[PDB]
Design a protein around this ligand. Sequence first.
Ligand SMILES: OC[C@H]1O[C@@H](O)[C@H](O)[C@@H](O)[C@H]1O
Ligand SMILES: [Mg+2]
Ligand SMILES: [Mn+2]
Ligand code: NA
Ligand code: NA
Ligand code: NA
Ligand code: NA
Ligand code: NA
Lengths: 129, 1024, 121, 129
Amino acid sequence: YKKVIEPVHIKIAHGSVTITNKHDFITTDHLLFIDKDTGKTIDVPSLKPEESVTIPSDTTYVVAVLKDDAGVLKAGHEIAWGQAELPLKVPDFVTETAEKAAKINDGKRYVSVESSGLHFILDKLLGKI
Amino acid sequence: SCLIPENLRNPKKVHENRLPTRAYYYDQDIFESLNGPWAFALFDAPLDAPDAKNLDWETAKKWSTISVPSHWELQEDWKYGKPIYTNVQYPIPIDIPNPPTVNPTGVYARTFELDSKSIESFEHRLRFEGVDNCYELYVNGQYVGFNKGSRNGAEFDIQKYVSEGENLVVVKVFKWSDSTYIEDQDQWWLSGIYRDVSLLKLPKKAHIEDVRVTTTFVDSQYQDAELSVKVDVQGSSYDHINFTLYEPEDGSKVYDASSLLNEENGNTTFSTKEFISFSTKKNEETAFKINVKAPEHWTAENPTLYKYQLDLIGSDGSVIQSIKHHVGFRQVELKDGNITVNGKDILFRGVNRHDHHPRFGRAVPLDFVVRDLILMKKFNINAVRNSHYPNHPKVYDLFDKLGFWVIDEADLETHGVQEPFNRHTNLEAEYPDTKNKLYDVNAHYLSDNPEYEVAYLDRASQLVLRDVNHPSIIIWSLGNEACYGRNHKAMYKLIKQLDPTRLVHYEGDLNALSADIFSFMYPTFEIMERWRKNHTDENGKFEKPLILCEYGHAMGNGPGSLKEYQELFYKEKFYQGGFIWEWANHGIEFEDVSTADGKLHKAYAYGGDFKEEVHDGVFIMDGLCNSEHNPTPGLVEYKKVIEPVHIKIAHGSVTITNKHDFITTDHLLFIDKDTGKTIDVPSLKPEESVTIPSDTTYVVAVLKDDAGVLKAGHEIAWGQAELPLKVPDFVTETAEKAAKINDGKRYVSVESSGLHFILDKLLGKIESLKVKGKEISSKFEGSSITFWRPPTNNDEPRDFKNWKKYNIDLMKQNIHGVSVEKGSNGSLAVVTVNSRISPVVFYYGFETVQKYTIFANKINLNTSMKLTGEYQPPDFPRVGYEFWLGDSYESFEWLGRGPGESYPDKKESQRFGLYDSKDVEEFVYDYPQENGNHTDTHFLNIKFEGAGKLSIFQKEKPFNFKISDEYGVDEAAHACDVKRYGRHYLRLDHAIHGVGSEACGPAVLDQYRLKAQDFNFEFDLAFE
Amino acid sequence: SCLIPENLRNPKKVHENRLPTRAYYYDQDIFESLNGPWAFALFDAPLDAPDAKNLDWETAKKWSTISVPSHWELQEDWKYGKPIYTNVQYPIPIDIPNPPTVNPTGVYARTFELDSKSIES
Amino acid sequence: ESLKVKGKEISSKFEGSSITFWRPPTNNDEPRDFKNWKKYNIDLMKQNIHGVSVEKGSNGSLAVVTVNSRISPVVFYYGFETVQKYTIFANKINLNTSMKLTGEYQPPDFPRVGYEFWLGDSYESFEWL
Ligand SMILES: OC[C@H]1O[C@@H](O)[C@H](O)[C@@H](O)[C@H]1O
Ligand SMILES: [Mg+2]
Ligand SMILES: [Mn+2]
Ligand code: NA
Ligand code: NA
Ligand code: NA
Ligand code: NA
Ligand code: NA
């Protein structure tokens, strides 16, 4: 719920961060915007209700946080955030394809595959490892 | 050493400009609270902190806020560091009187508003109830003063510095100073303004500064009393004082958290039932003495109070100021070598209580202290020791109203001076009659150091003068573990000078050269007994009594042998009881990664968890209550041993002895639990007894009506007739049934109708036993009979070392021969297993014979174990079987001690009865260790879903059992670290080692030790 | 102690039918190596091991192989357990002269070919 | 904090004290010497500064910085009244170290005594006689 009702929208696409103030009355001036990829703050102009700004940036992840203690909230409290969409990258695991002899036993019920560092048994009756 | 400020390294600089200590009284009309959010910044050391003479509110305004009162090591996300636990060792280097140069400095700032009329009408003060370690105070950019003494209060005159409108308060707080050396209690190191801050507005022209109330009996017969009231009024513009004493409210008054904490006055009419009035006359002494006609005695068992109102009255006849408080008519004396209250030689049923809260630390809300005290009363406690410093001033009224004998203790421990000595000389043990010679050698650093005299005296002066009007305080204590020196004598002289009405305690002063009482901690009975005899003369007279200011160390599973201590207390007039160490574990709530789970869990921190350079580990976890301040089995056991009424049932009789000090048994309802009907018991005075003939087995003594903080029906005491071990009338099936017996190569099989028994001959292991739909099997790792338990805190220093050394956890069963024969006298088969049970690497072990006699519906298991070989261990943790319970397993029920756990030297609070596992909340230890054993078990029923029960009993002697799914307890640091199997097991034990208090105190007593010897025992496994 | 075989618990049973010790000399013409892969199976204790008086090559043939010479605690993937290091302490209980009843037993098997002339020569 | 002379930078490797005494225990250290050193908290030696004196150079030096401190581990009395005198030249820094052993309950020996410095990013190799 805290996320969907966040009073500031942060959108990251096409080398840009678009920040829209979605409060009813207050500006964004009390908030510190951090580029989470570098840890350094982004200088964001004071935005009124419904005003927005597009800032060009290489960032992936931006957080909007409280500058100082205010009300019952502490400095550093997270009001809003945004992320650029993360593409699914295939991890660079290296499959061992070297020619290693393997002992294969296709028994009555159980099938066995044994090699160096490997032991695989499947129950043919059940489809069970 | 100019890089460390002068005042932080000067033991004589105890304060600057602090007002003299006066008796504490809270007044809603005078006290304005300055608690709440304050601007705050932390600095590495004093030189990084701003000069407060130039700090604006506009500058400070911009800082983060912290809430006062609180410790700065206990903040959201550990923003300002973490707690540090040390017992003895100082967390700093010793270079008296220098603190480290790197010295965390917190600066606090807030504002408050002042009226035009306020400055005209009132003298303005600031009062700080407690700040750790010390601080300087500024108002409106101007230096007001300085203060030391972390658990003492302080007031400062603010009138000169105050302005109309906005006023600025700045407090510079330092973590270390010369004072650190005398504040080395076994507790968490925590800092900050951790107690209330208040703005006091006192009437300007004249006001009540101090009051002194004493009640002294005129007579040897403790009837008529002199009430003395001395008032110190400040200023000229007053006429006289009025005093009104009201009719008493009996100590049996009902209280709750709400009425105890109610702070309302002003327009609330205090009381009406006038008993005595008195007026001073113009220009005369503002003090008086009046004779009071046979007043109601104040006692811890009956805390009867007379409310009073004291009015300062002007020339026009109006009330300038009022004090509303209470008088407790009581007198403490050292009389014929005993501590005596109202002519009576009392017994301490006591406990040591630190200020501790699992989230707030030493910043304990009053609500929570009330919670503590109610709980104490509910568990038969009558005395509290303020280990080792005064509490929040508002707590002492709670003692007055609820009724506790209180030892109020100076904030002074010097223990750390000993640590290098302990290590340099490889010191292993300290003993109460002998140990003071070890402290003597290092006394010169602090307690015998003339530079510290002013500080030691100040701790004394501050202790007494703030709390001097509370009838519940009967003893002042000079501190704890600060060796013995000239400064202690100086403290003693001052206290007797300031308050002649009470006695002085100091355990470090072995021979009581400057104390009125003898005091031991954790002594053996031998040591108690020698002391008695050396201080009892030929006549049978003694000059001073002995108390145990600390005994029965309550760390983890324990303490053992509270019974034997109590027997000693009642037997000799020389012993006046003691105080358990301690009330509660000092655990701090935090988030721990689980060893069982790989996930984050709520847990309670001790040393090491906050990653301290140096720490003392689990030694902070030594309470009768857990970190969350709830009763452990330790407290349950304590309530029983200290019960103030004895109920003995033997020979068709109930003998009832009143063991209170003052009150009768009249408020108690005695119930015959076998019939539910009450027993008419005559009114018994202290030490009186009556024998009543009855057929009863079980008698309970219970409260007739709500009284104090206890409810009608609350159990004070109980007694049972001893229960003989009856063989259950289970019917063994001995009918001739053919049985299929297969004695294979490795496995032996016995099959019959409703029965399947498989034994692995190679291991001595029951692969499976399935009788009438119910299944068990051996829980086997090395041996079918195991000896190990997860070491308790008490086991750790010695017994565990021995058991580990002798490889008791690595016991192996080596099978020699298995014999299989057809049944004879109704049995289906006899399987006999011959083996040696012995750990790897050792000679010692048991020539073992396990005979399984198998019936259709029962299995008889006869175990013979014969101890053989050189180099044996002294004792074992336990000896018994471990069985996996089948998937069907659902609950258990037993005849024996309950509802909770019991151990040989910690069992008598668990009365005999039939108990159901479902009715019991299993106790979770904060530090995982041996738990959940049930001793003196007559029989055990284990229920299987839709298959009836398995009944288990031992021949001729009751047994021990545990049923759980837990493992990895040894390695588990916290409750969340405990691993759990996918099924339950039964730990079925012939015997189990006692529990003791050896973490700090005597070893498990000889008659409770499971000594190395032969074992012979027979079990029946009877299937429904 | 009949669940542990007599010869494993008899200090005097140093050997049975071993030839007397003689000075060692390697000779290529006399020594034929039997090193290489051998059929092998591990058992918990002697009583689980097969009676060798009835063990065929056809039966043993089907087992996994281990290479001789080698330790069985030093195999691919620790197939047959791991090494144990003790200095002084015995890794077993002391009950001289008994070994533990649980006593890892490895059975090795292989074949070799013999000539008509070889047995004569 | 930093010493940068002619493009070369060093600084104190600091955890508690500028003069440290600890070494990773050898196998030979383990049974006794390590036990002693650990017992006496030699790994937790702290340097507590008392005074720092700063004066203009005299015989060709640029400045003289004198540090007065106690070097002592937590929880113990024993330590060294220490004087560290830095005489600073344009191309050289002379460091005079005086350490005076004081206090009751002293350890028998130390693993070592000396300074620890971080080498600057430029660092590439070393050479010694
Ligand atoms: O649990 C250990 C306890 O030992 C006592 O000697 C001491 O007075 C307590 O403050 C506490 O340290
Ligand atoms: Mg202590
Ligand atoms: Mn944990
Ligand atoms: Na401490
Ligand atoms: Na007594
Ligand atoms: Na403790
Ligand atoms: Na544990
Ligand atoms: Na060895």
